[PDB]
């Protein structure tokens, strides 16, 4: 379906979950954005102010779309594919506790995901895959995309 027809995207972080430290919620989803940007044409570009074309926001329960969260465990995350206004956006559960870690859910591997689908992307039918619909933590400083992954993205891109 839809793909961002251009290459410099924007982002901006509306709301910061109190879970974490400032600087390493900016850290997780700036990294999280790298690893697509490493694969792919695009770049991508934090904005503090004004309409980007990613808005990442910390949410729970009912949150002002058709995807009401279910309190902590269940759902973690949810992001709509590319285009105007809401396109691109990606929520986070604020009923998680979000970490750069094991411990909790690690923000990273799930941004990572959530940006798969604010670019295009479904999910994977593969474990593997950081698209497959389950949730493990893998060691996020040694963290690769699959190949299945790279192969769904430079189908959409590049
Ligand atoms: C590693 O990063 C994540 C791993 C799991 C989740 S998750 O929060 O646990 N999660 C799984 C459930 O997804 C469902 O999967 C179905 C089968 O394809 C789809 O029909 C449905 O649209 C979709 O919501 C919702 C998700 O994928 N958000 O993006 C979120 C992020
Ligand atoms: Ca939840
Ligand atoms: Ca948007
Ligand atoms: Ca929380
Ligand atoms: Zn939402
Ligand atoms: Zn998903």
């Given at each position: 379906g839809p793909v961002w027809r251009?290459?410099?995207?924007?982002?901006?972080?509306?709301?910061?979950?109190?879970?974490?430290?400032?600087?390493?919620?900016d850290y997780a989803i700036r990294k999280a954005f790298q690893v697509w940007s490493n694969v792919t044409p695009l770049?991508?570009?934090?904005?503090?102010?004004?309409?980007?074309?990613?808005?990442?926001?910390?949410?729970?329960?009912?949150?002002?779309?058709?995807?009401?969260?279910?309190?902590?465990?269940?759902?973690?995350?949810?992001?709509?594919?590319?285009?105007?206004?809401?396109?691109?956006?990606?929520?986070?559960?604020e009923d998680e506790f979000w970490t750069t870690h094991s411990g909790g859910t690690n923000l990273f591997l799930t941004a990572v995901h959530e940006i798969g689908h604010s670019l295009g992307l479904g999910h994977s039918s593969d474990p593997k895959a950081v698209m497959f619909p389950t949730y493990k933590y893998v060691d996020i400083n040694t963290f690769r995309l699959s190949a299945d992954d790279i192969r769904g993205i430079q189908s959409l891109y590049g």
């Amino acid at each position: 379906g839809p793909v961002w027809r251009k290459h410099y995207i924007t982002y901006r972080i509306n709301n910061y979950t109190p879970d974490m430290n400032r600087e390493d919620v900016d850290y997780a989803i700036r990294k999280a954005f790298q690893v697509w940007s490493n694969v792919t044409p695009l770049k991508f570009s934090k904005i503090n102010t004004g309409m980007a074309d990613i808005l990442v926001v910390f949410a729970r329960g009912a949150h002002g779309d058709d995807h009401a969260f279910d309190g902590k465990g269940g759902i973690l995350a949810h992001a709509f594919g590319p285009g105007s206004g809401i396109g691109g956006d990606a929520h986070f559960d604020e009923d998680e506790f979000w970490t750069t870690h094991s411990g909790g859910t690690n923000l990273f591997l799930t941004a990572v995901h959530e940006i798969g689908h604010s670019l295009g992307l479904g999910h994977s039918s593969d474990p593997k895959a950081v698209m497959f619909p389950t949730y493990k933590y893998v060691d996020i400083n040694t963290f690769r995309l699959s190949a299945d992954d790279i192969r769904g993205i430079q189908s959409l891109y590049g």
